[PDB]
Design a protein around this nucleic acid. Structure first.
Lengths: 623, 624, 624
RNA sequence: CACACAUAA
């Protein structure tokens, strides 16, 4: 039992009472909200040849724990909010696992109680840190996580539900010891860069206090870590031999600026196939995976050495240059709004669809509360079809990455969406080609599509991903020097150290998501990445403004229309039919939605003026 | 970009702008409707020893399709119309793939825009042809697809949505080069055979124009096909040796008319086990699959040679003889209607269930209720349980095949269903035993069940499947001679060249679905298949009419009943309850549903008079 | 066809007409309800090292005329009733399979018709027995199953739906030849032990009549069982050599009373690693699974020998001792009710949530997946998270064991739930740690949480599980000696012979579920298990009463509140919104539930007083 | 094993 004071908020951490059979278990309570988190790791190595870590955050109720929904999990599955929360917890603990820890691991979160005041998602991140800290699972230092909000110009740590509604910033910071930053995830209301940067410093300060509390509990409990059967890092003998065999060939490939995505990847594969045959005869007793991983380490090292020593990327540009950006709007006559945004070899097609305000509810109390209701009747749906990477995969359903990128792009465009719009706004982003930050291209393409559709957004929104390449001391672990890369390619993200996706208007920041592969980075690097990304965002907005600078004066002539019809009381029964049979038959035959306003007035929403025309023919003949 | 003119309609083909990473990609636009189709094929042979081809046609948003609430709902969120369209595209392009192309392939269709006038399903089939033609995937010859309708006596190519609603025919034709036919799929309003056959001729001519346009685009673009690392076909020398080993034994099995489905397959399995061991020792270095495929080649060739040379089939029938047909009706008292149709070793149990109109096509969620309503309040649900073939399988959710067979059987019975029926008609067909065309037996059995249930259908509907066995010289690819088989068995479909399922009444055709396994067949063969099936259809209808010839004079006395109950305004609040809680509870414990049709009256629908008794005692005590 | 008379009930059994392709099929008809059950077993040995047996019972509401309810107009998912019935059929037929029969097997039940009078779930169990008896699948003697009710103090065999609603007992008995019992599954309205016991012997008497009828049908129609490729059982000489290696080490582990669950499992596993390595050297050609199973045979035999010979268990308890029981209530402030029940190393956390009355009608009509309404507004959700056993597994649904345990614990507490409670009672039971009967700990912890929350339950409910260890004749198979164990651990259930989960009040029995692994046990053993569990139940209730003995005088202050708000007619449109949009929006972001009672009256339900405060502000500004 | 998780995203 350890209590951590974070300003006026109190955090209580305990262990050893519930779920004693798990490898690690902890209960983190703030106020009257208690969350129990368990960690289980198998002692038998898994054949997956990577780290199989899965985080499952579950809630027993929706709408601030007021509508019980846990009994519906067998068919109503997992909500979208739970998946996003699991992604945040996953990103806070994944980088800290030791390299080569190829053992199945699962972290589960149970909401013992929710008071509707303190948000349990932050307590879940801390609970996952305490459970792994107190367990015998090999894990690096404890992680503290807080949420920073801004209310009336004041920075509030772990704001309540009431305070978060009046906040202009929703930033979650995960911190490692020595004030390192592990995970960042924010959605701001177009706040200034200086205000945003100060809140990160405040957040990292609080996470240090939590780490101090968790360390004390670890010392009192007396935790001893297991000895894994084998850490699957390749031996230094194999790596140093692979360097002598493929350094100069990989160096030539990565300094060739005529390569595009597929040709560069093919060229690397050609070296991999030739080298791996020579590696097998050199070490016949070596594990087949160790041959695979030894080449990956060498290729990654050669890729980073060029950036560090020559300040030039694999495609020839410098650390601050953007890829070629092309924009286009109004491609199809029938779409309410459309845009095609291309960034290098990343292609994203965005579509804006207007619908009735009544489409934001599912007509069922439980299901509507599960997915919630959007504040501005605005949502974004992000798709990553398998042909974007010339691959074959299942097309039904959205994986975790698609959910995360959709919420990131939606948060970026949210602050500029106007209120009291007559229609529900749906933005659909499809990644036709992918070589980089397609999620940020969904904010740029979504902004162009919204302006093309006639939605009077306050300002355009652009995004950009910032990569990182560091050279750290092998023993001390300190970062000797680093390079910040603007608008990274896929290979630069794969071989890089972070994926700093940040979007906003030309005078503020609206969304941010940092995906750090390192076990924490200094706050100075994060500070410089935000400033560097703002320069890139200025250039991108210049290109977009040439294509379209202001929303069109009105919606498309063939767009949705809302009209009001009058039915007499005598004719009411015939028009509606037996139990609303006629209204739903008309809805299912022409797509028009009819709602009852008052005892004589019916609201009619039609997707097209033609659909209204034929629907009105039904109304006239039935009356 | 290439524009193909099909009468008064225009087809626009494009490539090289969107999704350049895919192996092939194309955008087909008609009017203001555009569909982009991509094809991806791996360079590594798949572990499975067949061609894995997946076609996924996805509607981006009907009205505003939005997104399913969660992952599991997404995995079930594919609509029935999307699945049927994907099957049509799959059958149009699968026969043109080379033999032995055991590589994973996926074709994905994305609806860029829909104007509500030009139907995108036909454009998707063409887009899949252009995408595969411009890709490096080896695909034999482009195909073209058009939809032919009959509006007030005129054959219309690619009719609009308004024209399709007044059409008496909904026929989709996919054609290969040289006027071949790859796919056929029709849904007619009981039209004459001569009118139906002419529409096929008109459609094939139009698809040749599309193929000409695609061929020009291929030549102008400069497509180069990949070289697969291995085409998995048995070597000619190992097939020849297998022929000498098992020609006589297989010939004896296929000439033995005392075999049924299980016995014949068991006998062939016995020869396969004996032959495979001998093959392995002769060719130790042969691929283990190559041993299996060599026997399948030999068994298929022996099976087809018997019918080509002797005009006799494995069960002793000639080319136009039907299997034994027996029918029953009214087997269970509580069923609204029932029928047990048996054809050969295929048994189908059909049930008819009536339900209220309000709870007949209408669900609670209007957003998802679209693509879920029926024109005549009529639908058919088809089930293929795993015990029909003595196999073990999952029973969770219908697969694509069950959805396709149910739609085909529903289209066959749709034109005879009366309009303005008091109740929603639902026909359930279960395949208890499967050895042949179970989908067609669902039309015949469904017709009997509808007649037994008391539904005044205009005429009885019967269906049949027609097979094909051809002899083609590999040096030319032409078809020298062929045999058309009536009411094929399972082995005749497996070793045959087509599955020509056509259904209709005694004076017209109501549905058709040709599943051609050859890379195109001439129009003459299709012309004779329809005529030959006409003879078989009338023979089946003779047997069916013996069991029952007209619908029963009235519905069963223990069927659903509807009447109104008057509720005063003062009693309305107590009767309905807070938020309709009392009615919702009543509809749960008992099957009765209460729908308000007037400010003072309520329409009560009870599935059975016995359940109606339970409802009446509830509403009497509520009234007090 | 064979007819069996059960008092006033008639049971018609037939075969040879439908689904003739399956290995075994049968149709069982009582009254107008007929059920067809088919059994299919593969011939190739399964890759899995156990018995793969799946039983699927499908409602198929087309038989009742009430299948078409949702927008897909077909059933989606499997209901709770379907899953529970499948488990009962599985428990009745699983023990009779021969040991080592590792062949894939599936049993499928199809409801041809239901009259709404005779329950088809009992006929499904009999049909599963006839289908297997007539098949060639190796299966032991036929099983007869009946349902016994008590109406007006009279025992009724196979009661109808009308009688089942006025019955104080719902007991299902499956019997083997020689009056053995293979399955017991009951739920009673707190009936006396003697009345409960007399129904069991009445039920077994009726099952013998059914078995006699099935035997006659099997005699009439020739049944020849297949010869499996091999029965996967360890060699007698390999088992004997394993016994010599690990007799003493295993005996030492099981006589060490200081072991807990994990340490005991690890100590046994250490001997397994040492012995299995030595076994391979002695028998190089033996199957790798044969080595694994031979050790499990020796370990099981040593474990049971200690109990039989010395009357002491692996943790030092005698045959009638309970583990340490610790209770605790009022765990958290915001929960309406909560309790933490611990028994030995099994820890269960129970929660009570009061919901609106309108949220308990989740059924087919409104929801595409849910079906039915609980009689009393009361349900129990049971969860078994993977960390309860230090394991990693999927956490989504599709778990039948959780459904079975939840239903057992729910009907254990159902008789004591008060009638006409203003709110829906939902009890959530989570197994934080498991080393035994977590399903019965859910009943003990459920009553503590219900009393803590303020629900005026009639009396407390406790549960316990009784194991069994028998020494049977190697040839005859008759039971020569047996020991009944109270509150078995996980190892005692795994190595035992039955899992007799029986719960109830201090003066009666409310639930029972016997999981017998033997091919039938004498009724005398069942009788003594009930008596033994009665003694344990009183001891458990004594401990529970010390923590809390009576329900709290009132619900918690932060519990739900229901109050009515009057709106004028002129403001009805503004408050409700277009098509009820405002009500659906307020209730989605606040958690309240508004139901229109009268023209001007709206009943607002708020889960917490704070929620009502937020809602009241929302209504107040709307009224402005 | 598969599934889910992570993965040139």
């Amino acid at each position: 039992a350890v209590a951590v004071d974070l300003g006026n908020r109190k955090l209580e951490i305990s262990s050893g009472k519930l779920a004693r059979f798990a490898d690690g278990s902890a209960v983190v309570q703030s106020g009257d909200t208690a969350v129990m988190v368990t960690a289980v790791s198998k002692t038998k190595p898994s054949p997956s040849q990577f780290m199989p870590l899965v985080v499952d955050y579950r809630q027993k109720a929706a709408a601030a724990g007021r509508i019980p929904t846990n009994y519906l999990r067998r068919e109503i599955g997992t909500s979208d909010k739970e998946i996003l929360t699991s992604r945040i917890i996953d990103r806070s603990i994944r980088p800290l696992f030791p390299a080569g820890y190829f053992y199945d691991t699962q972290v589960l979160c149970n909401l013992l109680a929710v008071d509707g005041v303190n948000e349990p998602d932050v307590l879940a991140i801390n609970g996952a840190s305490v459970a792994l800290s107190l367990s015998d699972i090999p894990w690096n230092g404890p992680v503290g996580a807080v949420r920073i909000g801004i209310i009336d110009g004041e920075y509030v740590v772990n704001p309540t539900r009431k305070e978060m509604s009046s906040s202009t910033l929703n930033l979650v910071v995960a911190g490692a010891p020595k004030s390192q930053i592990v995970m960042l995830e924010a959605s701001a209301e177009n706040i200034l860069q200086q205000d945003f940067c100060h809140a990160i410093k405040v957040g990292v300060k609080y996470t240090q206090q939590i780490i101090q509390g968790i360390q004390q509990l670890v010392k009192e409990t007396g935790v001893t870590k297991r000895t894994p059967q084998k850490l699957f890092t390749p031996s230094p003998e194999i790596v140093k031999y692979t360097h002598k065999l493929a350094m100069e060939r990989l160096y030539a490939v990565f300094t060739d600026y005529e390569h595009d995505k597929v040709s560069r990847d093919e060229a690397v594969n050609k070296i991999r196939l030739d080298t791996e045959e020579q590696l097998k005869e050199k070490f016949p007793e070596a594990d087949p995976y160790e041959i695979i991983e030894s080449f990956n380490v060498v290729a990654k090292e050669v890729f980073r050495s060029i950036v560090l020593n020559e300040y030039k990327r694999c495609d020839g540009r410098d650390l601050t240059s953007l890829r070629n950006v092309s924009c286009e709007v109004d491609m199809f006559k029938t779409l309410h709004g459309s845009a095609l945004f291309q960034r290098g070899q990343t292609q994203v097609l965005c579509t804006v669809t207007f619908d009735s305000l009544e489409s934001g509810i599912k007509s069922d109390q439980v299901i509507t509360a599960i997915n919630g209701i959007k504040d501005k009747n605005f949502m974004l749906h992000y798709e990553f079809p398998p042909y974007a990477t010339n691959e074959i995969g299942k097309v039904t359903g959205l994986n975790r990455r698609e959910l995360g990128h959709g919420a990131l792009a939606e948060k970026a465009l949210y602050p500029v969406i106007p209120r009291d719009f007559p229609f529900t706004i749906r933005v659909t982003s499809e990644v036709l080609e992918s070589n980089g930050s397609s999620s940020m291209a969904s904010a740029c393409g979504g902004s162009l599509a919204l302006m093309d559709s006639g939605v009077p957004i306050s300002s355009a929104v652009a995004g950009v991903a910032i990569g990182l390449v560091t050279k750290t001391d092998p023993e001390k672990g300190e970062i000797e020097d680093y390079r910040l890369l603007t608008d990274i390619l896929g290979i630069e993200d794969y071989n890089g150290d972070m994926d700093f996706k940040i979007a906003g208007t030309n005078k503020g920041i609206t969304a941010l998501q940092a995906d750090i592969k390192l076990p924490g980075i200094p706050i100075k690097i994060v500070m410089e990445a935000i400033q560097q990304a703002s320069v890139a965002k200025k250039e991108i907005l210049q290109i977009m403004n040439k294509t379209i600078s202001k929303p069109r004066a009105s919606r498309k002539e063939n767009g949705p229309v809302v009209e009001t019809v009058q039915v007499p009381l005598s004719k009411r029964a015939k028009f509606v039919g037996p139990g609303g049979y006629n209204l739903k038959k008309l809805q299912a035959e022409t797509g028009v939605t009819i709602s009852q306003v008052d005892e004589e007035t019916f609201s009619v929403f039609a997707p097209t003026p033609s659909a209204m025309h034929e629907a009105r023919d039904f109304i006239t003949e039935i009356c």
